[PDB]
Design a protein around this ligand. Structure first.
Ligand SMILES: C[C@H](Nc1ccc2c(c1)OCCn1cc(N3C(=O)OC[C@H]3C(F)F)nc1-2)C(N)=O
Ligand SMILES: Cc1c([C@@H](NC(=O)Nc2cnc(N)nc2)C(F)(F)F)oc2c(F)cc(F)cc12
Lengths: 1021, 227
């Protein structure tokens, strides 16, 4: 199994500088060899065979290079160590010993399997030894997706391969808002091209001034024109010369590995558009296609070693299941009286009938041996129907659960299963007081140590299968053959209502009645689907027919149909089809975290969503990267290990050379986890100067230097990480004492972007909340920008790469409000100046620039006021808020703003009070102390007004992004109850004009609390 | 009508879903326009309002219910256990609850920890098993090869080299016995801890209902002081 240690040896983080290893020889001798911790296997094999001549049977030992080492890893696996460059410390050994053997099978195959294993954090052989035919089916069938993807990639080589790697980093629309266009000179942009001339990297630069919407091929053409200037060519010779050569070159961003390989307007590339909006001057490097195409590997895809039915609608009986007996259950016979098995049939978390219990039975012996009869008929079962059961204690009369388990009533072959079934059960979540857990994972606990409940399903003298579509289409016409002026107005007004809005049982009938009209308002579909009665086969079969011929909808809307409320496979395939056809890679990348989460809701391993994502990951390596990490981050998790592992296996088997790069990232991350695990456990008492010494000492060693230099940033794999600057590495003074790391940017032209690449590694905290909050903030900004509201946010990078381990991107030239005040020389004042901040900006942006900085601060300040309100981020202070030198403000450190949300001992609801500090208002008003009535402040209030309304106007999208996360694992996004707050902030129950005034009140209420003395800044006396 | 017991002001749906949790199909309450929440098939149905559909037969909301009555409701009042003694027991039932609350968390701190350590041991044992298998194959490799050599040296007078072979052999098997001994001492640690787990579970399942009913009664003592 996967290991919990990152120790170099079982239950030991660091190997002593030298250790004894027992080397079992191929002539059956055993010698003990003292080794360096950091020694390679080649220097270990050399030294062994030398000393092996002292020992008997030295005569049988063939050439040193005829043999391979074997040992047992901390995953209890026989690893054959093919790559002998590897060091003893990096071998992940259980017990310090090696066995010298003759290599056996297909070397190529075995090496790749190891690489796939290491990558996914689980050995491939564990999958081979799994009997579930669904598993082994998935493994074989999914290679269709892999073959398709690999074909696309090597279809129009080598451009296609360069497209997979280095896909264009592009906005979703070419159009520019006016605030962006007005930023251009005259619809034009000044661009700097670069070329590497001499072997020792001598650089020439061409400064073009081109229209913003020129495609890269035209940029290159204009560059050719500038160089062929003064070569006595005719219009014809020149025009011919550009045409011939404009497509023998590609542009690349100087400083990172982004390329402009596709015919999009230059403005549409995110790097350019950023430069435009930042007022910076794009520095692109020009090179020949061969220079890139030659560096591409041209990888090869090995195919792995693993290569009487009655319908359901002709079985007119009531459903019934038999609870036989459990093995045990962990209940005290003192205190607790009796135990029973509660059951229920469910469609998602909607029950399809009444829940049915068994008779009471004494704790000590659980045997029931009775048929439970269920209040629906076998044809009336929907396709996504599930038994959800548990075992309960009974002690007024206080019921509680013990163990629980859920089952798909049809398997993945559409086969309504029958016969005997053992079901090893799961422990209850933390705070779950409910008798049943239908949201929990469907299937049997792979922990066989757990209580095990046997079941019997009714037999029907043949295999029962869910009907074909033809059968279901017919029955729709059997089902039917048996308006007003304010009606159309009414069901227009309930598509505009949000998903979290509550629909009356009248409105459900209303919708169902007018279901044929609804096809003309196709965004109503989600609501109509909630009006369906899924226990009624008659309604379902008709709805299947509507969905089949339903108009596509925006992918932002199709997404809703992938959350927990829409279990039906037909409804889901629709969503996947909408996504297949209308979802840009831009948006797929932007919403990838939710799309990965909702894989967990899928009933079966092989499905349309998985096949869609897997294809996009294997087609676009930017997507694939975060595909891999979002999955890898959860492999520790009992519940999803097997699914995600299986999915990771398919990815890693077809992703190409990137598997190699991903190993380098993984190995680096492992060393960081181990190193920091030490600092957290064994040296938590030791002082922070002593820790620095130890850190330095370990990072110096050659095994660590090799591991953590020359790999790609997981935050952004366009960025290379070169040599470590250990002098700049340090332990930060924050919660969980995270590492601050620093790498040289090894780009030939790094000076034109950034020469140092800084990442915060944080071992200890769950980062999923930060990830999600930042994503939201990004989306908010994307909405604003696209509508032409120029509010600048700063959603810096954050990535969970494991169980409470992740990276944060550092932003340069930025400081907490606190840090800014201390810089200005406090003078020991108990209260901070309040003009200090504005002062700091003036000093930083002198004269010419000044107004631009205030503008940016005003715009950023506005975005975060609105974002912070809507989301209810109450917990802001002078070390959460940060400001860049240019004036841009942003918020950091989320993941604690929900800690005080739940009531307690009746203390009323903790209001999230919208306030803005006086220091910020002063900056907005350029130093005026009457800063509550300036033009600056009105213009600012207006920004906030428009922003608020824009997010409100897109409320459904945010609601759906949160809804998809509910089954994830985050303890703070558990139920639709947790999201509800946003309805209050956006005022979804009121009018638009009432909401604006609500927000206007809330905002004007803030600054009534001005001149609040704040009599001590450290301790808040 | 405002006074009548089954009306619950204008409360959120989380609060409502909480109370309609785990009831028999029939139970109900009204809340704010007026809507009526209800159980049917074990679901929380929503029904707007005087009447539902076309024929608006009724004059007030309190009548409407009572015709469909011909359903046992949730009560704003009915809190089956002077203002002075009740103000005391809130400090007593809330301390009794909060002492168990912190005892449960510490039980969970053990529960979780103990759960992981067990899974670790199970991995370790799998490892030892594979380790030991490898040494056992090394033993059979030594027999295959030393067979032809031990007979040669036995055929010569040379039993100096017999002694050298078997010094290696004795070390190997002595080593095996030590590894088997380590697996065994872990197998007992695993079985000891698995029972420690099973026990920590039994205590949690015994303190789980105690924690619920201590919250139910404590919550209704607050409802008496605010009414
Ligand atoms: C020179 C140094 N620069 C800096 C520091 C922290 C962050 C940052 C930049 O920007 C990236 C955003 N960020 C986010 C966080 N953190 C966070 O989100 O939680 C804790 C804290 C860090 F300790 F991880 N820290 C930073 C400074 N001002 O002291
Ligand atoms: C849950 C959740 C939210 C909700 N916000 C609040 O409930 N704020 C609030 C209200 N009252 C108090 N006392 N404290 C905080 C909401 F945004 F959905 F409304 O936002 C989240 C977010 F951005 C990220 C994430 F991982 C989870 C969430």
């Amino acid at each position: 199994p996967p290991r919990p240690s990152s120790g170099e040896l079982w239950g030991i983080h660091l190997m002593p500088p030298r250790i004894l290893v027992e080397c079992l020889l191929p002539n059956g001798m055993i010698v003990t060899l003292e080794c360096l911790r950091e020694a390679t296997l080649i220097t270990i094999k050399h030294e062994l065979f030398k000393e092996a001549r002292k020992y008997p049977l030295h005569q049988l030992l063939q050439d040193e290079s005829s043999y391979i080492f074997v040992s047992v890893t901390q995953e209890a696996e026989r690893e054959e160590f093919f790559d002998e460059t590897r060091r003893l410390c990096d071998l992940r050994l259980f017990q310090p010993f090696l066995k010298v053997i003759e290599p056996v099978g297909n070397r190529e195959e075995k090496i790749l399997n190891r690489e796939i294993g290491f990558a996914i954090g689980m050995p491939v052989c564990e999958f081979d030894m799994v009997k579930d035919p669904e598993v082994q089916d998935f493994r074989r069938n999914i290679l269709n997706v892999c073959k398709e993807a690999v074909d696309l990639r090597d279809l129009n080589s080598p451009h296609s391969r360069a497209m997979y790697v280095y896909p264009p980093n592009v906005e979703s629309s070419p159009e520019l808002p006016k605030h962006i266009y007005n930023k251009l000179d005259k619809g034009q942009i000044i661009v700097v091209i670069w070329v590497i001339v001499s072997p020792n990297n001598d650089k020439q630069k061409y400064t073009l001034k081109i229209n913003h919407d020129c495609v890269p091929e035209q940029v290159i053409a204009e560059a050719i024109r500038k160089k062929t200037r003064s070569m006595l060519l005719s219009s014809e010779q020149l025009k011919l010369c550009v045409l011939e050569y404009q497509g023998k070159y590609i542009l690349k961003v100087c400083g990172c590995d982004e390329y402009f390989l596709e015919k999009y307007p230059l403005s549409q590339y995110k790097y350019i558009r950023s430069c435009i909006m930042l007022g910076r001057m794009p520095n692109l490097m020009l090179m020949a296609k061969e220079s890139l195409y030659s560096q591409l590997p041209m990888d090869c895809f090995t195919m792995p070693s693993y290569s009487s039915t009655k319908s359901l609608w002709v079985i007119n009986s009531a459903l019934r299941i038999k609870i036989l007996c459990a093995t045990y259950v962990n209940v005290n016979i003192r205190d607790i009286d009796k135990i029973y098995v509660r059951t229920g049939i469910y469609h998602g978390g909607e029950p399809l009938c009444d829940n049915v219990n068994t008779q009471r039975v004494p704790c000590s012996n659980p045997r029931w041996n009775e048929w439970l009869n269920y209040d629906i008929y076998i044809p009336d079962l929907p396709r996504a129907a599930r038994l959800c059961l548990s075992i309960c204690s009974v002690k007024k009369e206080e019921h509680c659960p013990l163990a629980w388990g859920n089952i798909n009533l049809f398997d993945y072959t559409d086969t309504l299963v029958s016969g005997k079934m053992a079901l090893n059960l799961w422990p209850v979540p933390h705070g779950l007081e409910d008798l049943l857990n239908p949201i929990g994972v469907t299937g049997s606990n792979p922990n066989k140590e757990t209580p095990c409940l046997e079941l019997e399903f009714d037999w029907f003298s043949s295999v029962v299968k869910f009907p074909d579509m033809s059968v279901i289409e017919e029955h729709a016409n059997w089902s039917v053959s048996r308006l007003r002026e304010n009606d159309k107005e009414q069901l227009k007004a309930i598509s505009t209502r949000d998903p979290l809005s509550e629909i009356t049982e009248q409105e459900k009938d209303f919708l169902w009645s007018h279901r044929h009209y609804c096809v003309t308002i196709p965004e109503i579909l989600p609501k109509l689907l909630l009006s369906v009665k899924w226990n009624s086969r008659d309604e379902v079969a008709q709805m299947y027919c509507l969905v089949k011929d339903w108009p596509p909808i925006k992918p932002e809307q199709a997404m809703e149909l992938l959350d927990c409320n829409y279990p039906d496979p037909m409804v889901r395939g629709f969503a996947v089809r909408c996504l297949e056809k209308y979802l840009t890679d831009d948006k797929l990348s932007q919403y990838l975290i939710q799309l990965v989460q909702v894989l967990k809701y899928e009933q079966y391993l092989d499905n349309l969503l998985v096949r869609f994502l897997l294809k996009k990951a294997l087609t676009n390596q930017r997507i694939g990267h975060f595909f891999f990490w979002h999955l890898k981050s959860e492999m520790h998790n009992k519940t999803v290990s097997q699914r995600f592992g299986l999915l990771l296996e398919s990815y890693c088997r077809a992703c190409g050379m990137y598997l190699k790069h991903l190993n380098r990232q993984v190995e680096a991350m492992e060393k960081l986890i181990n190193l920091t695990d030490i600092l957290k456990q064994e040296k938590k008492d030791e002082t922070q100067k002593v820790q620095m010494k130890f850190l330095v000492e370990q990072m110096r060693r050659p095994d660590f230097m090799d591991a953590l230099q020359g790999f790609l940033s997981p935050l952004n794999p366009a960025h290379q990480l070169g040599n470590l600057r250990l002098e700049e590495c340090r332990i930060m003074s924050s919660a969980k004492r995270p590492l601050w790391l620093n790498w040289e940017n090894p780009d030939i032209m790094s000076e034109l972007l950034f020469q140092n690449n800084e990442i915060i590694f944080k071992n200890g905290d769950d980062l999923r909340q930060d990830m999600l909050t930042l994503q939201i903030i990004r989306i908010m900004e994307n909405i604003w920008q696209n509508q032409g509201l120029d509010l600048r946010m700063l959603p810096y990078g954050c990535l969970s790469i494991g169980d409470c381990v992740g990276l944060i991107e550092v932003v340069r030239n930025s400081h907490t409000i606190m840090q800014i005040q201390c810089k200005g020389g406090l003078k020991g004042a108990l209260q901070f100046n309040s003009h200090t901040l504005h002062q700091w900006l003036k000093d930083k942006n002198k004269g010419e620039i000044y107004d631009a900085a205030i503008d940016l601060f005003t715009r950023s300040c506005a975005g975060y006021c609105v974002a912070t309100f809507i989301l209810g981020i109450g917990d802001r202070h002078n070390s959460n808020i940060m400001v860049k030198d240019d004036g841009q403000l942003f918020h950091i450190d989320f993941g604690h703003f929900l800690d005080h949300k739940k009531k307690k001992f009746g203390y009323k609801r903790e209001r999230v009070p919208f306030v803005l500090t006086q220091d910020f208002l002063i900056v907005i008003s350029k130093g005026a102390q009457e800063c509550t009535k300036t033009r600056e402040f009105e213009r600012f209030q207006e920004m906030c007004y428009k922003a608020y309304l824009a997010i409100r106007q897109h409320a459904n999208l945010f609601i759906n992004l949160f809804s998809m996360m509910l089954g994830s694992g985050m303890p703070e996004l558990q139920s639709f109850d947790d999201i509800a707050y946003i309805r209050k902030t956006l005022a979804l129950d009121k009018t638009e004009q009432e909401a604006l005034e609500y927000f206007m009140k809330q905002m004007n209420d803030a600054h009534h609390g001005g001149w609040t003395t704040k009599m001590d800044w450290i301790f808040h006396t | 009508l405002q006074d009548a017991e089954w009306y619950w002001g204008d409360i959120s749906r989380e609060e409502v879903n909480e109370k309609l949790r785990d009831t028999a199909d029939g139970t109900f309450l009204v809340r704010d326009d007026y809507t009526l929440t209800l159980r049917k098939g074990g679901n929380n149905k929503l029904i707007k309002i005087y009447g539902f559909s076309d024929p608006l037969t009724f004059s007030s909301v309190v009548e409407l219910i009572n015709h469909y009555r011909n359903l046992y409701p949730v009560s704003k009042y009915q809190q089956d256990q002077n203002i002075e003694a009740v103000g005391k027991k809130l400090h007593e039932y809330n301390t009794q609850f909060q002492e168990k609350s912190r005892e449960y968390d510490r039980l969970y701190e053990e529960y979780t920890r103990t759960s992981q350590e067990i899974q670790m041991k199970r991995t370790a044992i799998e490892a030892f098993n594979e380790t030991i298998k490898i040494f056992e194959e090394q033993c059979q490799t030594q027999e295959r090869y030393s067979k032809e050599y031990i007979e040669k040296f036995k055929r010569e007078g040379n039993e100096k080299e017999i002694q050298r072979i078997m010094h290696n052999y004795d070390k190997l098997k002595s080593r095996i016995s030590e590894i088997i001994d380590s697996r065994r001492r872990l197998e007992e640690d695993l079985k000891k801890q698995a029972a420690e787990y099973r026990e920590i579970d039994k205590r949690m399942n015994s303190i789980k209902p105690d924690l619920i009913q201590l919250r139910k009664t404590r919550d209704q003592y607050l409802m008496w002081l605010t009414q």
